């Protein structure tokens, strides 16, 4: 069922992530581990080599791409500018955090501007809530309709990935599972 999320061709930018449920199927869970192709494999609530219990209703898999040293903001707690304005997973978490390198896939010499991250949001993001709007921020002044002039910031910013960056700045693809029942 998930040779479709861990091997997807074009990944999503973090401010617009693609919540994908998988149900009505026999979930394998044995191809995620016993594979050394992951940089981080951190599963919090339930353990691997035990999750063959009845989570066949609404297993989710949230995928996005973020920079390398921003992988540390996809833990419970761990505030920042990804876990506040882009993707905040809650404190009482049970899924696994999976992240592998994608330097050869998502890097251009001039720079990929298709990937983004939302830098300016009015309030912090709630657990598992997405925002895709493009609204001019109006940080300190009296607000206006939006001309992008002085003190008027564009609410998204690109990464600009490149091949010869540092390992903290190379693009990482993150897939975060989440199990819940009825």
């Amino acid at each position, epitope marked *: 069922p998930f040779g479709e999320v861990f091997n997807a061709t074009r990944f999503a930018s973090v401010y617009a992530w693609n919540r994908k449920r998988i149900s009505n199927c026999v979930a394998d869970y044995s191809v995620l581990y016993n594979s050394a192709s992951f940089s981080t494999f951190k599963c919090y609530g339930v353990s691997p*080599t035990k999750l063959n219990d009845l989570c066949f209703t609404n297993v989710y898999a949230d995928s996005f791409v973020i920079r390398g040293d921003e992988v*540390r903001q996809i*833990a419970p707690g*761990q505030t920042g500018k990804i876990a506040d304005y882009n993707y905040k997973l809650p404190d009482d978490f049970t899924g696994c955090v999976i992240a592998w390198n994608s330097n050869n896939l998502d890097s251009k010499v001039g720079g990929n501007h298709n990937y983004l991250y939302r830098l300016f949001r009015k309030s912090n993001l709630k657990p598992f809530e997405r925002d895709i709007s493009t609204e001019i921020y109006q940080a300190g002044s009296t607000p206006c309709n939006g001309v992008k002039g002085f003190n008027c910031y564009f609410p998204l910013q690109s990464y600009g990935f490149q091949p010869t960056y540092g390992v903290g700045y190379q693009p990482y693809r993150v897939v975060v599972l989440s199990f819940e029942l009825l």
Partner: antibody
Amino acid sequence: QVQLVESGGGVVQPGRSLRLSCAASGFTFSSIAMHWVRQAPGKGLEWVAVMSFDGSIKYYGDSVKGRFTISRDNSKSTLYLQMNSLRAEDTAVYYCARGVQGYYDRSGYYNLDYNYGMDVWGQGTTVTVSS
Amino acid sequence: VLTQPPSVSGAPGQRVTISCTGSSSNIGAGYDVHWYQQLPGTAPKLLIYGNSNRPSGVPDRFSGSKSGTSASLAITGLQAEDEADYYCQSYDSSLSGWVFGGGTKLTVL
């Protein structure tokens, strides 16, 4: 409103013991690892001990190896440190620091050898050893 | 023990870099370097974690970096309140413990 108030200050003699309690409110204490860190007066920072998710993994510092003992209580949300046979060098300000909720595992085995630092910090018990 | 300079100096508006050199088992083993702001008379606060992630609350002047076995930091446009010390933190698998830096008294002229 996250906070960490810790108690157990005073001036003691070399060759006896002490205990350092540390309350915690506002957050889930029963899921986050917890550290103890101390600071000699005017000098740098040093690390002492750590207590795991439930109380299974305990790693101690290079200096307190054999003299200290760390416990915890998830019933009243309170970390404990037992310093046994205090030398004349254990004078510091003892900080009770919140670790990280990290309790990951791959292929089953849980572990506490992390990267993540200490998010919120205590206030400080200033124990003093003297004669 | 991570090698860190004793004091760095900078006039306001300038850019001061607090270096930190560790061993091959401290930072070069592959554990992240964090930085702390300890004002005198106050418990420290985590300035940067995971070598680049600034938490909610620190301004956009503290950059943070890591290169091999020796991390660093940079403060641009430093003002008259940055009188604090700035330690480091990492892990050492040969010691099975958490290490700290030494202290860098940043003074503003």
